């Protein structure tokens, strides 16, 4: 179930494979790559 | 032939073609008009308020 979760996390959730990405090309040449992971709230009830 | 890096062009690719489509889905919830499709059938919901 968690890891399902975490998959689902990783994908279809967070702009796509540009992080996972990044994450390589960030830590090849400037020697780490670092992402910052905030909560954050989400709206649209009825209105 | 051991994963060829067309394959993850036309990936990213398809990633920022996404952002167009998302366009075209405000697009859509504005307004297209009362149509349908024509995918093996006439008739299919209207895109007017997905």
Wanted: aromatic content about 14%.
């Amino acid at each position: 179930q968690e890891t399902e979760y975490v998959n689902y996390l990783f994908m279809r959730k967070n702009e796509g494979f540009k992080v996972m990405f990044d994450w390589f090309q960030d830590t090849l040449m400037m020697k780490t790559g670092v992402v910052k992971v905030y909560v954050e709230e989400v709206l649209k009830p009825t209105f | 032939a051991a994963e060829q890096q067309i394959d993850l062009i036309a990936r990213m690719f398809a990633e920022t073609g996404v952002k167009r489509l998302f366009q075209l889905l405000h697009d859509h919830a504005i307004k297209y008009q009362n149509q349908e499709e024509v995918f093996q059938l006439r008739g299919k919901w209207v895109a007017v308020n997905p």
